[PDB]
Write a protein that binds this ligand. Structure first.
Ligand SMILES: Nc1nc(=O)c2ncn([C@@H]3O[C@@H]4COP(=O)(O)O[C@H]5[C@@H](O)[C@H](n6cnc7c(N)ncnc76)O[C@@H]5COP(=O)(O)O[C@@H]3[C@@H]4O)c2[nH]1
Ligand SMILES: Nc1nc(=O)c2ncn([C@@H]3O[C@@H]4COP(=O)(O)O[C@H]5[C@@H](O)[C@H](n6cnc7c(N)ncnc76)O[C@@H]5COP(=O)(O)O[C@@H]3[C@@H]4O)c2[nH]1
Ligand SMILES: Nc1nc(=O)c2ncn([C@@H]3O[C@@H]4COP(=O)(O)O[C@H]5[C@@H](O)[C@H](n6cnc7c(N)ncnc76)O[C@@H]5COP(=O)(O)O[C@@H]3[C@@H]4O)c2[nH]1
Ligand SMILES: Nc1nc(=O)c2ncn([C@@H]3O[C@@H]4COP(=O)(O)O[C@H]5[C@@H](O)[C@H](n6cnc7c(N)ncnc76)O[C@@H]5COP(=O)(O)O[C@@H]3[C@@H]4O)c2[nH]1
Ligand SMILES: Nc1nc(=O)c2ncn([C@@H]3O[C@@H]4COP(=O)(O)O[C@H]5[C@@H](O)[C@H](n6cnc7c(N)ncnc76)O[C@@H]5COP(=O)(O)O[C@@H]3[C@@H]4O)c2[nH]1
Ligand SMILES: Nc1nc(=O)c2ncn([C@@H]3O[C@@H]4COP(=O)(O)O[C@H]5[C@@H](O)[C@H](n6cnc7c(N)ncnc76)O[C@@H]5COP(=O)(O)O[C@@H]3[C@@H]4O)c2[nH]1
Lengths: 124, 123, 124, 124, 124, 124
């Protein structure tokens, strides 16, 4: 089974699973999010596949997809919206600031790799 | 509708809001589309992500993903990259920040359980 | 020596001191907090002893006691109360957020150890 | 109920309770930590009271007691010892750095209050 | 006085003073660092002024000078060097990561202000 | 080259350069901040030199100068002022809290070295 062990343990809406095998860097590049609930006719309320960029965006060889910062930017935008709205919380603000600091560190990774001419290459 | 992102250079994809504001004032559908293009003018990447919109117990809701799911995926990938040959301190700081975000997201869920407001449209 | 070198250096109310010997894990399991002041009769204004859990809560020869998360939860509650009251501060708020993040990491440790089924055993 | 809602939800050794009434600053100044487990004799295996300084130390009719930085310094010492011993973890390290940064902010509070000549007085 | 109350309280090499009057945004734009020790001559061993950009750089009547990210980038370079050398420490590491995160947030400000077309203007 | 590679890439007011050679502990002890702009006469609008303490302050052939805490205290004071003024921001607040945590870690280093009697000596 390829079920992710998550920090949340109670009242989970969905489970997440690794899909396929290990790829470049030792990571997976496909995930499925699927609901802990079934519809009236016995099917998943949610069954959602996320495919990540696998290989350089410049080869046609590559599995072209999303990058982790895209997912974090989506979460960042939603948390900002929630904080502007009626159901804001301190827990949200702490989550949002850590999300933004993670994105800034991912951008650090992009910029030092640009400086070293190694972005888009399989090099440490 | 296009997201202004923290990354400014060498961006692979663009992210856009889909639809209108919903419960809590947020959007519940997003599109990620590649900045690169194929021969016929079709995006090389065009993926929609739909979020839970309305309570999961209600059959009329838009059932979908929740943000901690996406953060757990990113967490798992960062752990795999740190165990692999292309690890970095930048990766490690990002991973710890993602994990602390997930910890605060769980604190929210648990607080809302404590106050008997989880799954309700209330602060 | 058994007197703790603390982060605070001036206007300390109390001193903290280790009691006994190193135990499981290389740590001490009993501490005393004693006042830096003495009463009219020449006695400590404060002399408090804290005994930690030492060995498995299941087996009877263990020294049964408190755990560190209990102490941080007390401090978290008091800081929350102070922030609601009239003598709140930014310094309090930073302290409380770090206390809660420490508690969340202690719970990460507990949840990692339940998942590995090592909780309550002398296993790294 | 005076029982504290804690961060950890599963496998709790002990329960923590506030004791007394709201005091200076809106906080409680006594807490009890009691075991979730039982002897054969019918009593709690753990039942420990922690009384905090309530009112200034110089005033003779105050409830002299511990302060929160004492408790976090104990936890800091134990965490350092665990990290130097055989059962270390990244979760311990993250908790320890947060505990030390909380102690650093508590000291900032003390030092700021000395600056403003309000340490030991009921004022912001 | 115009002397800064600093985090460091003991064994301080220098004092810092703000110079001039409060300017745009409510801040001071000139500072002096001077040694706590004097030479045989009687004058300070260190007396260093730092002027900050006051007014937009495009306007020639402005006081052109340094900006805060310059100073933090100097400190970041020095901490990186110390860590690569013989006298490294965990305290240095925590300081460096915080300096770098402060720089990332200063950059976030600049980029936000570019986004809103307010960079180099006297507005929030 | 001796150019500092900075976290900010866009709309930079100034460049920062190392001057001289590596010194004690592996770090540079002199830095120039110079404008990315020039006046009506082809001369830098800005050209500060910052010289750091190099060698123990209490010996006399040492180069006496500033220390990194001095620069962060300046930045801390300015950020506090900007946050009290009309052009405050969340980005400023995050930068300021990181600056202050950096300073408290610098002070941790100083007090640790005092306690070990290594402050002012070339020793790890
Ligand atoms: N243009 C562009 N902008 C970006 O922001 C970006 N982020 C990643 N990439 C590139 O996407 C492609 C897909 O990654 P893959 O898993 O195949 O290889 C990756 C992966 O195996 C590993 N890696 C280690 N840590 C990370 C990490 N944090 N994010 C991504 N990849 C990582 O290290 C390889 C090279 O990374 P980059 O050197 O950033 O180039 C990648 C690569 O060309 C980017 N390309
Ligand atoms: N069982 C369960 N476990 C979870 O982890 C979980 N996380 C979210 N939800 C529920 O999904 C549904 C879809 O959210 P919607 O946008 O309609 O309403 C949400 C949204 O408008 C707003 N909100 C504010 N901050 C957040 C946030 N951080 N995450 C999600 N929703 C948030 O506040 C409403 C109630 O939130 P919850 O009270 O968490 O219940 C939600 C809701 O029932 C969960 N349900
Ligand atoms: N049920 C339960 N819930 C908890 O939250 C909990 N926290 C600790 N314990 C158990 O209490 C007992 C007292 O600790 P001791 O010092 O004797 O051994 C400990 C100690 O030597 C070491 N250790 C390393 N890091 C830590 C740490 N952060 N907290 C406690 N103990 C730690 O590693 C041993 C086993 O740890 P756990 O595997 O958590 O079980 C402990 C232990 O059985 C708990 N038991
Ligand atoms: N000498 C000395 N060194 C210390 O480190 C210290 N820490 C606390 N105290 C003093 O202990 C006494 C007991 O606190 P009480 O709850 O009655 O009043 C407290 C309390 O109601 C409230 N308060 C707000 N935030 C905090 C906080 N973080 N810690 C303690 N008290 C706090 O604000 C009052 C004055 O605080 P201090 O001004 O720090 O003086 C206290 C007080 O004289 C100290 N005294
Ligand atoms: N090109 C460029 N790149 C930079 O990185 C940068 N950083 C600052 N500046 C500009 O320098 C000039 C000098 O600042 P002054 O104190 O007069 O006004 C400042 C000051 O009064 C206030 N302010 C609030 N927070 C800050 C802050 N964190 N840094 C600087 N100034 C700040 O808000 C005004 C406008 O700030 P910017 O809108 O960033 O433009 C400034 C201004 O034109 C920059 N210009
Ligand atoms: N009195 C006093 N109060 C201070 O706050 C302070 N901070 C630094 N110093 C002393 O200034 C002198 C100049 O530093 P130098 O680069 O030549 O040597 C330094 C430097 O080579 C290296 N070092 C490693 N990390 C750091 C660091 N974070 N800050 C400064 N120096 C550092 O380790 C040497 C000894 O450091 P200290 O042992 O703190 O003593 C220094 C030294 O005597 C101080 N002296």
């Amino acid at each position: 089974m390829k079920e992710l062990s998550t920090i949340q343990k109670r009242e989970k809406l969905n489970t997440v699973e690794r899909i396929g095998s290990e790829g470049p860097g030792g990571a997976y590049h496909e995930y499925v999010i699927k609901s802990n609930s079934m519809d009236s006719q016995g099917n998943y309320d949610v069954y959602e596949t996320i495919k990540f960029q696998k290989g350089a965006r410049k080869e046609e060889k590559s599995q072209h997809g999303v990058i982790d910062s895209d997912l974090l930017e989506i979460v960042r935008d939603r948390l900002k919206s929630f904080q502007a709205g009626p159901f804001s919380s301190r827990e949200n603000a702490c989550a949002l600031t850590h999300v933004e600091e993670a994105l800034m560190w991912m951008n650090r990774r992009v910029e030092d790799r640009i400086e070293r001419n190694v972005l888009g290459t399989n090099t440490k």
